[PDB]
């Protein structure tokens, strides 16, 4: 039921324990040096093994 100006689809692969790092304001190897999500991130995170 929503409209958006644009949607960005970011795809990558990480191991199991770093999926928790895909979240706003996180700390860790991913959220520090690989892929940092903004504190006010608006969107959906989808992953699967």
């Amino acid at each position: 039921d929503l409209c958006f100006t644009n949607v960005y689809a970011d795809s990558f692969v990480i191991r199991g324990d770093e999926v928790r790092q895909i979240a706003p304001g996180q700390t860790g190897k991913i959220a520090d040096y690989n892929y940092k999500l903004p504190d006010d991130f608006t969107g959906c995170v989808i992953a699967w093994n």
């Binding site: 706003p24 304001g25 700390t27 504190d39």
Partner: protein, 48 residues
């Protein structure tokens, strides 16, 4: 209600997501302190 009344200490102790909550607690408290002071000053100035 915050973990500390010192703001730099909260900033140097917590990660930004939780420091935001603590700093919002301090901001609400201090803003209420100003509002109380200004309301009280307004009433006292009416008396004066």
């Amino acid at each position: 209600g915050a973990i500390s009344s010192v703001l730099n200490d909260i900033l140097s102790r917590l990660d930004p997501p939780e420091a935001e909550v603590q700093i919002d607690r301090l901001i609400t408290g201090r803003l209420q302190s100003l509002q109380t002071y200004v309301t009280q000053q307004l009433i006292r100035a009416a008396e004066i």
